């Protein structure tokens, strides 16, 4: 999936 | 109308600003309770009906808690359920690290758990250790934290994917060095079941695994396990039993090997990865069965590894991917949801254990075993469907108890009939097949198809049932109802619904409007929990009791029982966006979000930042709290940027036709929708300065950020592209072929969709293009950026670049995220927002 | 004094400017004639005394030419020698590509050639083909281009490093898949001599090579061959002969393997390299000998591979590196120049062929062969020297004909006695050694040392003889003179000198002052060619005839004979810099170059760009034409930048003590010298604006550019660091240990010298730090940049980055260089020079 | 050698 992960 | 120019802070001052505003968002960034389970007390004298178990974060680690559900409540007051810790205190590897990328797990601790109802046995992994505890079975209910009991091992490496045998809670299985092992938690016996992989060998000459989901299945189909316990034990005359494990065996020998930079940069080395790039070989797959003979007192007598009577390619013609698998509730058949390469044909196929025979290299003894299996034993394609768009795999599949011998009854969901995902009750006839194995021919395409006796639509309309990311059904087999999540009231809100599956008609909404809900329904179908929020209010978690009116069991009502997690409350810094919409020239209503600049001055126009994803399987615009993950859009608004987000055609929760708009054409239509919505806002709101528009996104969002600057440099002044796809030939089979087809069948779409082939079309002015990328990215390889740069250099074009050397397709190290936010904010200031930015042209 | 702000051009306009100015520098960037050789006509009736042969570029490829040297000349006119092509017209691999990096070859075509005087046979590689032609031997002299004759082969892969056997010009040797082969160019017989490497295997399990110089020796010691033909054949009683090849056999099994990104970025792969990082294992080395028995009519009878009687580590105690090797002129001894690990001990060691015995795994037959070799046969350390700074390896070593049995006479050069490189005539006594192999002990350190009978200083003073990059001696054994290049007249100019080696006294300069000269002396010692230039005039190549006065053969004079290459002439765009100097507080005169801004306005101060290298083995500041390679410093001057270059302490051509200033302390002293020289200029020239100083350099220059910004942010506004060393532990043994020692013996120097360990010390303001790096760099690995970035991100520091994805430690693709120049010029404009740059703070 | 190569 072209889905990045960043929650901060 | 004169231009507003943002306050021009230094790098150190912006770091301070961002740090201060991050300081009051530690408590916000905390996991809500999840993975709920209801267990009945069965105690007439006691005050509690149920105990609920769940995973939650009380900066703490994720762990198991329980709460007590009372039989009665004081309906004047609001009951806050206290969180009791289930576990006492305790005394990453590469495969954990990668699984956490594949599952998109941002949090730390216990990720999941198994439970055996009949014994109360919990099984869960916590760090390297596999652990078990007992609660809520024959042994009763604890009033204090339980000690986790380590499952001891002689295995040197990390044990992955532990599962309790439902047939016997003394037994567990797990993966170790890509082979299936089992372990008995009472006797401490440990046994390797498959001998397919060698831990000591190099991956270049050792590409076979068992019980494991390969990269494409974890990344593109959300399947993380490759083995499944049979739920029932077969008794032997001796007094013991036979336990069974169906598993997938993979051979990745012909799959291409790429090299990804090793995290330990000091080594100046690179790890090997089996990566099936679009148009190249996926792994060679098959089903296998491990037959495990246990004696009267729980010791292993023997293990017989078994294979399909004929090859996988013969028995399951045209199948590339094992999307899902499992067993029927009595263990008579293994089931599987199978896809073809194009992902335009789905099949649900029952597989009997009698299709499997022991592995035998001796050709004489093998031929006796083949003929001993009857010709009546065959694969049973209980359901088959096709589409001209694509099959979206989901987790909805419920099999009812087998009432008649030659029939199977089940609920499935599909978009293939109407173009929206709906529930269908299906009954399929298990005929003896026309194909006979003795004759010595090969089976024709349709020879394993089952006739459809009954196919009733349970739901219908211009709205979808949800089957992904935790959304599923819950079937009440007593009252003959099915609970499900859907978009019926609004595409901006998820809601819980209920409907009959026998005489389907009225669909009753069980959740309150003005919130989006993610729900869990009790196995007993007398409670549900909702994790819910809206644009203004942070997420809450509440328990609701279900009941029927006296006169009609079909009708279902709900009543607030208790609060599990209270809302943190509206944060004073955070001003939420307004949801807008507009009728597109494409014929669809398109939704968006608008962050107005804070302290809006009249007679002044502000610089605009378009945050974008704009890709399949995601909806950014809905009625949920955006003050956690998208908190920095508010920060941009607080400094004087207009912030816009638009869900263009291709995004999800609007049916298959809407999603199918960019089939074969990714990158070609999305910016039209974005510009249309952006122009709608500018004519309506005169504070939007169209001369200073920036665009920013990650992954597909970064892809579109590059497409925006390439296609529409007239609109977009700056583009900040995060981990973008610049070349579709680099991306994998499962994703690319689904949306774009095979490269040879879409030469122009692949060309037009690849910005690296069109470097000449980028702007010749600098300070307009910023590329961001994690250096260690194994999903969207850094070569996307490196090759784009190569062609930009050849074309004489300027660029800016920032690498995050410790990151993959994610930002996990705090310092990386802080630097990213700081650099982005400073970039926007210097090249879009500020007064110096205007002079710079 | 008000600030001058440079004209602010767009990216497209700067591209135009740079392209226009590059358009009149195609003819400038062309290789001068080189690799000269003189051959006598021996024709009393003919008008020519000699024919000269040379490699030259007439955008053309490098090829062989000849010119005719007349017996007499018209001394009124100037003779221009016409270039006759030697060759007719014809009908990269990884190892060619890497060799061209190691040798620093920028040009295309024939890189070198062999010649056998007695037959006239040329041997040379041209592309993949090895070729030969005949001229100037018994067969006479051609008056038209000769057809190159391909040496045919059955070898599938590229043949590297071809050499003619001096003993027999029918035979050649070459390297193929890291093994030595031989081929007869008449009979076409082809034979593999060593069986040490397998072409089909992986390099991870196949680390042995023969006849090959490994990475560190090519990169750090300028040795590119690992095998050496014996110059004489031993006759056999049968009527045939024995040819010999000494060779180095290397085992790189224990050398660390790093991964460098593969040039084909689409593969997303990485190549394996044996890279000995500082403080880790170098290859295990030894000497071997191939004994090749040929019959009466040139067919190979047999090949006997031979090894040292005792191990290399026993016979050559303390030796890490075989720096050089060869044979004595009669072939009686093989010689070798050997270094210890610290590179503070050199040894010249003679090695007899009798030290080698046949390879035999049979322990019985081996023990007979060991005892058959006499104890008198032993290694002869003919010279040994030490230093507290380091041994600079050079190519000067001349062995005279052996006059007496127990003596050898030779010229060597060294800095160890006085601290400046001078020639010394040495005579060593070849005693029978105290160590006896029969006794069964091991030899003590001094047991192979030869007594020094005579050691006469041929040259002396506060100036050096040149022995690198083509600079060498030429010995006239008749007149007993030695020709050499030196710095005696000036450190800014190289000159040709001559002196007696018997009664050394007067040193006569044969070249004219006001130019720097690179020279080739004829083997007959009656001509020399000078390639010469100065700061104002482009390079010329001229022939000079040598002669003595009637009264004194010792004294040598010269006379201009002819021009080989005429000067292109002063280019109108190009204004050269002025050489300056200043007395440093360190006690040394330090030289520099100053490019004044073009059209210098009075009462105005200009932004300054300090171009820097500042590392060992290089001198940037001298009296040579800088309008080819450093043409863009003039371009910077033409737009209004002051450009400064300073040769700080540690640079070369100033003796060993001056070079030794930064031993153990690299990065700590260089910027003091640079700032001192920069402050000298500012007090003298008021047009230097010290508030706007930029610094830029490549490799060591990039290293110091980072050190400048880190240490002295008060001085330097911007730093542009090209392919920098950010971490000394990443760099190799040969270089790092020479200048910085072992990491454990210099913990603070390694720390202070590594900018990546000191990320916190960089500026918190952006637009001051620009990193540039070739992505495919196998010398200074990209990890230097990637790890620096990692720590800058952790420290919250800003950076700019540009990658050149097609480049290694060099810029070869034209588009890369064009983009680099364009981006650099634009960066300097926006962040140092222009009016907007001043506002930006 | 920490010596880059670029000739233009
Ligand atoms: C200072 C400005 C920072 C902007 C914050 C942007 C948040 C980035 C979130 C990354 C993920 C986006 C894709 C969302 C999805 O596909 O689920
Ligand atoms: C537009 C400005 C371009 C500046 C040109 C700089 C030339 C770079 C030369 C690279 C090599 C320097 C090291 C010299 C050496 O060590 O021999
Ligand atoms: Ca996934
Ligand atoms: Ca070299």
The CATH number for C560's domain is 2.140.10.30
* Six token digits for residue B99: 């699984």
**What is the secondary structure of B135-164 as a DSSP string?**
-SBTTB--SSPBPPEE------SPEEEEEE
| Cβ atoms of B673 and B718 closer than 8 Å | no
CB contacts of C10 in chain B (<8 Å) are 765
Classify the phi-psi angles of C222: left when phi > 0, otherwise alpha if psi is within -120 to 50, otherwise beta.
left
Rounded CA gap, B634 and B602, in Å?
A: 20
Element (DSSP H or E) covering residue C700? helix C700-711
| Cβ atoms of B303 and B191 closer than 8 Å | yes
**What is the secondary structure of C114-145 as a DSSP string?**
EEETTTTEEEEEETTEEEEEE-SBTTB--SSP
**Nearest residue to B654 (alpha-carbon basis) of B524, B804, B492, B505:** B492
CB contacts of D7 in chain C (<8 Å) are 29, 106, 628-629
Instruction: Indicate if ligand 1 lies below 6 Å from the C-beta of B618.
Output: yes
CB contact under 8 A, B11 and C765: yes
Indicate if the alpha-carbon torsion angle B313, B319, B322, B328 is positive or negative. Answer: negative
Instruction: Indicate if ligand 1 lies below 6 Å from the C-beta of A8.
Output: no
Size of chain C, expressed as the number of residues it contains: 841
Element (DSSP H or E) covering residue B134? strand B129-134
CB contacts of D1 in chain C (<8 Å) are 219-220, 617, 699, 735, 779
Is C28 in CB contact (< 8 Å) with chain B?
no
CB contact under 8 A, C826 and B766: yes
Q: Where are the beta strands (DSSP E) in B220-309?
A: 225-229, 234-235, 241-251, 257-261, 270-274, 284-294, 300-308
CB contact under 8 A, A2 and B632: no
Q: Where are the beta strands (DSSP E) in B377-435?
A: 380-386, 397-399, 407-414, 422-429
Task: Point out which residues pair with C324 in neighbouring strands.
Answer: C337
| Cβ atoms of C182 and C168 closer than 8 Å | no
* Six token digits for residue C233: 């054949």
Neighbours of C357 (CB within 10 A): 18
Three-class SS state of C165: coil
Instruction: Provide φ and ψ at B355, rounded to 5°.
Output: -65, -20
| Cβ atoms of B777 and B725 closer than 8 Å | no
The vertex-C42 CA angle with C37 and C44, nearest 5°, equals 135
Distance of CA C361 from the midpoint of ligand 2 (Å): 55
| Cβ atoms of B339 and B391 closer than 8 Å | yes
| Cβ atoms of B668 and B583 closer than 8 Å | no
The vertex-C605 CA angle with C604 and C608, nearest 5°, equals 150
B557-565, strands of its sheet edge to edge: B516-521, B527-533, B540-547, B557-565
Three-class SS state of B398: strand
**What is the secondary structure of B732-777 as a DSSP string?**
BHHHHHHHH--GGG-HHHHHHT-GGGGGGGS-SSSSSEEEEEETT-
Rounded CA gap, B769 and B831, in Å?
A: 10
Catalytic residue among B699, B705, B754, B810: B699
CB contacts of B699 in chain A (<8 Å) are 1-4
- Give the position of tokens 């507080």: C585
Rounded CA gap, C821 and B206, in Å?
A: 48
- Give the position of tokens 């920098």: C724
Residue to mutate (ligand 1; options B29, B468, B632; most atoms within 8 A of CB): B632
- Give the position of tokens 């034409």: C625
Contacts of residue C268, defined as CB under 8 A and 6 or more positions apart, other chains included, come to B258, B259, B260, B275, B730, B781, B783
Instruction: Indicate if ligand 1 lies below 6 Å from the C-beta of A7.
Output: no
* Six token digits for residue C596: 């004044």
- Give the position of tokens 């030894």: C286
Task: Point out which residues pair with C808 in neighbouring strands.
Answer: C810
Query: What distances in angstroms separate CA B334 from CA B16, B230, B348, B354, C714, one per listed residue?
Result: 58, 8, 11, 11, 74
**What is the secondary structure of C619-656 as a DSSP string?**
---SSS--TTTTHHHHHHHHHT-EEEEE--TT-SSS-H
Element (DSSP H or E) covering residue C248? strand C241-251
Residue to mutate (ligand 2; options C17, C698, C703, C774; most atoms within 8 A of CB): C698
* Six token digits for residue C18: 């740079």
Indicate if the alpha-carbon torsion angle C678, C681, C683, C687 is positive or negative. Answer: negative
CB contact under 8 A, A4 and B617: no
Q: Enumerate residues lining ligand 2, CB below 6 A.
A: C 613, 618, 630, 632, 635-636, 698, 701, 821, 824-825; D 3-4, 6
Atom of ligand 1 nearest to the CA of B635: 1
Task: Name the neighbours of D, counting chains with at least 3 Cβ pairs within 8 A.
Answer: C
Contacts of residue C647, defined as CB under 8 A and 6 or more positions apart, other chains included, come to C590, C591, C592, C614, C619, C620, C621
Contacts of residue C699, defined as CB under 8 A and 6 or more positions apart, other chains included, come to C613, C615, C722, C723, C724, C725, C780, C809, D1, D2, D3, D4
DSSP designation for C832: I
* B838: closest chain C residue by CA: C836
CB contacts of D6 in chain C (<8 Å) are 698, 810-811, 817, 820
- Give the position of tokens 């010269």: C558
Catalytic residue check, B777: yes
Element (DSSP H or E) covering residue C365? helix C363-372
Element (DSSP H or E) covering residue C412? strand C407-414
Rounded CA gap, B677 and B582, in Å?
A: 7
**Nearest residue to B284 (alpha-carbon basis) of B258, B317, B251, B328:** B251
CB contact under 8 A, C220 and D1: yes
| Cβ atoms of C310 and C290 closer than 8 Å | no
Rounded CA gap, B226 and B216, in Å?
A: 13
- Give the position of tokens 């009075």: C602
CB contact under 8 A, C725 and D8: no
Catalytic residue check, B653: no
Domain span at residue C370 reads 34-565
Size of chain D, expressed as the number of residues it contains: 8
Query: What distances in angstroms separate CA B158 from CA B88, C732, C817, one per listed residue?
Result: 23, 36, 49
Rounded CA gap, C107 and C104, in Å?
A: 9
Question: End-to-end distance of chain D based on CA atoms, in angstroms?
Answer: 21
Instruction: Provide φ and ψ at C14, rounded to 5°.
Output: -65, -35
The burial of B239, by beta-carbon neighbours within 10 Å (0-12 exposed, 13-18 middle, 19 or more buried), is given as exposed
> Which residue numbers of B have CB closer than 8 Å to A's CBs?
22, 25, 29, 101, 104, 106, 219-220, 615, 617-618, 628-629, 631-632, 698-703, 722-723, 725, 731, 735, 779-780, 809-812, 817, 820-821
Task: Point out which residues pair with C40 in neighbouring strands.
Answer: C50
Rounded CA gap, C425 and C324, in Å?
A: 19
**Nearest residue to C38 (alpha-carbon basis) of C401, C561, C566:** C561
Alpha helices in B316-395 (DSSP H): 363-372
Rounded CA gap, B741 and B749, in Å?
A: 9
CB contact under 8 A, D6 and C700: no
Classify the phi-psi angles of C320: left when phi > 0, otherwise alpha if psi is within -120 to 50, otherwise beta.
alpha
Inspect the structure and tell me whether chains D and B have 3 or more CB pairs less than 8 Å apart.
Answer: no
Q: Where are the beta strands (DSSP E) in C275-369?
A: 284-294, 300-308, 319-327, 334-340, 345-351, 356-358
The burial of B146, by beta-carbon neighbours within 10 Å (0-12 exposed, 13-18 middle, 19 or more buried), is given as middle
Element (DSSP H or E) covering residue C817? helix C814-828
Query: Which positions of C are annotated as active-site residues?
Result: 699, 777, 809
**What is the secondary structure of C479-512 as a DSSP string?**
TTEEEEEE-SS-TT--EEEEEESSS----EE-S-
Best residue in C104, C392, C469 to probe D by mutation, most D CBs within 10 Å? Answer: C104
| Cβ atoms of B81 and B564 closer than 8 Å | yes
Three-class SS state of C39: strand
Element (DSSP H or E) covering residue C720? strand C716-722
Rounded CA gap, C270 and C96, in Å?
A: 18
For chain C, the 3-state helix, strand and coil shares in percent, each to the nearest 5, are 20, 35, 45
Task: Point out which residues pair with B532 in neighbouring strands.
Answer: B517, B540
Burial C625-662 (b: 16+ CB within 10 A, else e): bbbbebbbbbbbbbbbbbbbbbbbbbbbbbbbebbbbb
Three-class SS state of B227: strand
CB contact under 8 A, B15 and C796: yes
Rounded CA gap, B146 and B134, in Å?
A: 8
Neighbours of B438 (CB within 10 A): 9
Three-state secondary structure along C747-761? Answer: HHHHHHCCHHHHHHH
Rounded CA gap, B232 and B235, in Å?
A: 9
Question: End-to-end distance of chain B based on CA atoms, in angstroms?
Answer: 20
Distance of CA B329 from the midpoint of ligand 3 (Å): 26
Distance of CA C638 from the midpoint of ligand 2 (Å): 17
Burial C795-817 (b: 16+ CB within 10 A, else e): ebbbbbbbbbbbbbbbbbbebbb
Task: Name the neighbours of A, counting chains with at least 3 Cβ pairs within 8 A.
Answer: B
Q: What is the dihedral of CA C328, C329, C330, C333, to 10 degrees?
A: 0
Rounded CA gap, C507 and C458, in Å?
A: 9
Rounded CA gap, B722 and B716, in Å?
A: 16
Rounded CA gap, C829 and C836, in Å?
A: 9
Contacts of residue B477, defined as CB under 8 A and 6 or more positions apart, other chains included, come to B400, B401
* Six token digits for residue B203: 């991956």
Rounded CA gap, B226 and B203, in Å?
A: 19
Interface contacts (C, D; CB < 8 Å)? 54
Instruction: Provide φ and ψ at B221, rounded to 5°.
Output: -120, 5
Contacts of residue C452, defined as CB under 8 A and 6 or more positions apart, other chains included, come to C383, C426, C427, C428, C429
- Give the position of tokens 């930029």: C694
| Cβ atoms of C338 and C259 closer than 8 Å | no
CB contacts of A7 in chain B (<8 Å) are 29, 106, 628-629
Instruction: Indicate if ligand 1 lies below 6 Å from the C-beta of A2.
Output: no
Rounded CA gap, B685 and B590, in Å?
A: 18
C380-386, strands of its sheet edge to edge: C319-327, C334-340, C345-351, C380-386
Task: Point out which residues pair with B172 in neighbouring strands.
Answer: B164, B183
Query: What distances in angstroms separate CA B770 from CA B486, B696, B798, B799, one per listed residue?
Result: 39, 9, 10, 6
Rounded CA gap, B113 and B132, in Å?
A: 10
Rounded CA gap, C539 and C571, in Å?
A: 12
The closest residue, in CA terms, to atom 12 on ligand 2 is C698
* Six token digits for residue C148: 């190159």
| Cβ atoms of C622 and C581 closer than 8 Å | no
- Closest by Cβ to D4, choosing from C25, C220, C809: C809
Three-class SS state of C352: coil
- Please list every residue in chain B followed by a chain break, i.e. its C lies more than 2.5 Å from the next written N: 58, 91
Query: Which residues of chain B from 770 to 829 reach within 8 Å of chain C, CB to CB?
Result: 775, 781, 783, 786-787, 789-790, 793-794, 796, 798-806, 815-816, 818-819, 822-823, 826
Indicate if the alpha-carbon torsion angle C531, C532, C536, C537 is positive or negative. Answer: negative
**Nearest residue to B486 (alpha-carbon basis) of B398, B535, B413:** B413
Rounded CA gap, C321 and C220, in Å?
A: 11
CB contacts of C259 in chain B (<8 Å) are 259, 268-270
Q: Min CA distance, B822 vs chain A (Å)? A: 12
Contacts of residue C427, defined as CB under 8 A and 6 or more positions apart, other chains included, come to C407, C408, C409, C410, C452, C453, C454, C455
Distance of CA C778 from the midpoint of ligand 2 (Å): 19
- Closest by Cβ to C725, choosing from D2, D5, D6: D2
Distance of CA C105 from the midpoint of ligand 4 (Å): 10
Indicate if the alpha-carbon torsion angle C606, C609, C610, C611 is positive or negative. Answer: negative
Classify the phi-psi angles of B161: left when phi > 0, otherwise alpha if psi is within -120 to 50, otherwise beta.
left
């Amino acid at each position: 999936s072209l889905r990045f992960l960043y929650e901060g | 109308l004169e231009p507003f120019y943002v306050e021009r802070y230094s790098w150190s001052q912006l770091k301070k600003l961002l740090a201060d505003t991050r300081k009051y968002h530690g408590y916000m960034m905390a996991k809500a309770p999840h993975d709920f389970m209801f267990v009945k007390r069965n105690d007439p004298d006691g005050p509690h009906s149920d105990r609920i178990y769940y995973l939650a974060m009380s900066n703490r680690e994720n762990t198991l808690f329980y709460s007590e559900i009372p039989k009665t409540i004081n309906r004047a007051a609001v009951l806050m359920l206290s969180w009791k810790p289930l576990l006492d205190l305790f005394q990453y590897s590469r495969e954990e690290e990668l699984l956490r990328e594949r599952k998109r797990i941002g949090t730390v601790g216990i990720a999941s758990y198994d439970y055996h109802q009949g014994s109360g046995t919990f099984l869960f992994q916590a760090g390297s250790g596999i652990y078990h505890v007992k609660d809520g079975g024959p042994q009763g209910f604890t009033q204090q934290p339980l000690r986790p009991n380590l499952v001891e091992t002689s295995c040197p490496n990390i044990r992955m994917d532990p599962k309790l045998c439902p047939a016997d809670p003394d037994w567990i299985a797990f993966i170790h060095s890509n082979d299936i092992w089992i372990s008995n938690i009472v006797t401490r016996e440990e046994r390797r079941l498959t001998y397919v992989h060698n831990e000591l060998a190099n991956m270049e000459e050792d590409a076979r695994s068992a019980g494991v989901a390969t990269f494409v299945l974890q990344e593109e189909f959300d399947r993380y396990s490759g083995y499944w316990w049979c739920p029932k034990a077969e008794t032997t005359p001796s007094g013991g039993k036979i336990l069974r494990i169906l598993y997938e065996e993979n051979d990745e020998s012909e799959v291409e090997i790429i090299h990804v930079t090793s995290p330990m940069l000091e080594t100046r080395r690179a790890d090997s990865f089996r990566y099936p790039k679009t148009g190249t070989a996926n792994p060679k797959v098959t089903f296998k069965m491990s037959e495990i003979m246990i004696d009267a007192e729980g010791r292993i007598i023997d293990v017989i590894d078994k294979e399909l009577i004929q090859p996988f390619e013969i028995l399951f013609e045209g199948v590339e991917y094992i999307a899902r698998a499992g067993w029927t509730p009595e263990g008579k058949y293994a089931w599987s949801i199978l896809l073809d390469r194009s992902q335009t044909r789905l099949q649900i196929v029952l597989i009997s254990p009698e299709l499997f025979i022991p592995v035998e290299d001796d050709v004489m003894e093998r031929q006796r075993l083949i003929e001993s299996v009857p010709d009546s034993v065959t694969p049973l394609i209980i359901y088959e469907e096709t589409t001209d768009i694509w099959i979206n795999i989901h987790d909805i599949f419920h099999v009812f108890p087998q009432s008649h011998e030659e029939e199977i009854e089940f609920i499935f969901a599909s978009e293939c009939k109407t173009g929206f995902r709906h529930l269908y009750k299906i009954t399929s006839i298990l005929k003896e097949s026309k194909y006979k194995r003795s004759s010595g021919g090969l089976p024709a395409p349709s020879d394993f198809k089952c006739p459809i006796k009954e196919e009733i639509a349970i739901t219908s309309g211009e709205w979808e049932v949800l089957g992904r990311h935790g959304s599923n059904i819950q079937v009440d087999e007593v009252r003959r109802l099915v609970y499900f999540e859907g978009t019926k009231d609004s595409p901006l809100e998820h809601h819980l619904y209920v409907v009959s599956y026998v005489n389907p008609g009225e669909v009753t909404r069980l959740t309150d409007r003005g919130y989006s809900h993610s729900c869990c329904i009790s196995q007993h179908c007398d409670f549900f929990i909702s994790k819910y929020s809206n644009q203004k209010n942070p997420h809450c978690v509440s328990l609701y009791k279900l009941s029927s009116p006296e006169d009609d069991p079909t009708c279902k009502t709900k009543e607030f029982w208790a609060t599990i997690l209270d809302s943190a409350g509206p944060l004073p810094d955070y001003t939420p966006p307004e949801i807008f919409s507009f009728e597109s020239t494409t014929g669809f209503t398109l939704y968006g979000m608008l962050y107005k600049p804070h302290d809006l001055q009249p007679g002044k126009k502000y610089p605009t930042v378009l945050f974008i994803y704009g890709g399949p399987q995601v909806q950014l615009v809905n009625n949920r709290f955006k003050g956690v993950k998208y908190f920095r859009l508010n920060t941009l608004a607080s400094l004087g940027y207009v912030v816009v987000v638009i869900d263009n055609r291709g995004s999800c929760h609007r049916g298959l036709k809407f999603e199918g708009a960019f089939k074969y054409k990714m990158g070609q239509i999305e910016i039209d929708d974005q510009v249309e919505g952006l122009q709608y806002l500018a004519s309506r709101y005169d504070f939007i300065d169209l001369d200073r528009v920036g665009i920013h996104g990650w992954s597909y969002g970064g892809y579109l950020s590059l497409m925006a600057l390439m296609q529409r440099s007239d609109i977009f002044r700056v583009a900040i592209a995060g981990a973008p796809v610049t070349l579709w030939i680099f991306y994998d089979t499962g994703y690319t072929e689904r949306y774009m087809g095979h490269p040879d069948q879409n030469e122009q779409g692949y060309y037009l969709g690849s910005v690296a082939m069109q470097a000449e079309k980028f702007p010749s002015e600098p300070n307009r293009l910023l590329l961001l990328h994690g250096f260690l990215d194994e999903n969207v390889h850094f070569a996307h950026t490196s090759i784009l740069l190569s062609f930009l250099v050849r074309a004489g074009k300027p660029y800016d670049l920032q690498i995050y050397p410790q990151e993959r397709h994610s930002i996990r190290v705090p310092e990386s995220g802080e630097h990213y936010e700081l650099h982005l904010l400073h970039y926007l200031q210097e090249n879009l927002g500020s007064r110096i930015a205007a002079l710079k042209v």
